Amino acid sequence: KHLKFIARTVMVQEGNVESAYRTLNRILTMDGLIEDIKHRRYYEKPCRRRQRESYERCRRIYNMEMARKINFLMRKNRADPWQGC
Amino acid sequence: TEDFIKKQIEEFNIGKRHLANMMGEDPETFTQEDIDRAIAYLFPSGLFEKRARPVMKHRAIQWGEDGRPFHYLFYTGKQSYYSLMHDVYGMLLNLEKHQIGSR
């Protein structure tokens, strides 16, 4: 019931149709539409969905914490200033 | 201890004098090479491993009778290596402050 050729529409730039398609695919991936399309092929039971969401939240939090720890400790990775001691 | 080593040194000197007497050599100029030649002649052993042949020749302890160690890095357990490293590091500090057939 909406107007056509406004949503999920990418204009090709100088005929690089491959590049335009890759840009549209990246947009869909970033907006999560691909995830929804593929996960709605089969019904995920609510308990399974809750378990998956909890696991994803835990994994994201753990990855962020590990990345922050690595970035914080990267400063120590300089050359040894007290070589021989 | 050092007392045992000193006793061994005195015993070696006395035995060297006896060996020089036996070989007829001058006890003064009776050097280590003369000692080795005399021992090889008097006790001819053909054992291939030269360490097993008869030999007449001249590790230590790192603290005195009071128990105080001589080296300030003794308690490291590797006082020689760490003293060498300390000296090298000091030389490197001095160089930094101031500024083939060998393997």
From Swiss-Prot, chain A:
Species this protein is from: Homo sapiens
Keyword Ribosomal protein: yes
Gene Ontology annotations for the cellular component aspect, listed alphabetically: mitochondrial inner membrane; mitochondrial small ribosomal subunit; mitochondrion
Record PANTHER family: MITOCHONDRIAL 28S RIBOSOMAL PROTEIN S21, SMALL RIBOSOMAL SUBUNIT PROTEIN BS21M
Protein known as: Small ribosomal subunit protein bS21m
Alphabetical keyword list: Mitochondrion, Ribonucleoprotein, Ribosomal protein
GO molecular function term, any single one: RNA binding
Pfam family, any one: Ribosomal_S21
Matching InterPro entries: Ribosomal_bS21 (IPR001911), Ribosomal_bS21_sf (IPR038380)
Any one Gene Ontology BP term: translation
Gene3D superfamilies per UniProt: Ribosomal protein S8 (1.20.5.1150)
Annotated localization: Mitochondrion
Family statement drawn from the similarity comment of this UniProt entry: Belongs to the bacterial ribosomal protein bS21 family.
Swiss-Prot record, chain B:
Organism domain of life: Eukaryota
Location of this chain's protein in the cell: Mitochondrion
Family: Belongs to the universal ribosomal protein uS9 family.
Subunit structure comment from the entry: Component of the mitochondrial small ribosomal subunit (mt-SSU). Mature mammalian 55S mitochondrial ribosomes consist of a small (28S) and a large (39S) subunit. The 28S small subunit contains a 12S ribosomal RNA (12S mt-rRNA) and 30 different proteins. The 39S large subunit contains a 16S rRNA (16S mt-rRNA), a copy of mitochondrial valine transfer RNA (mt-tRNA(Val)), which plays an integral structural role, and 52 different proteins.
Protein known as: Small ribosomal subunit protein uS9m
Organism name: Homo sapiens
Full-protein positions shown: 70 to 198 of 396
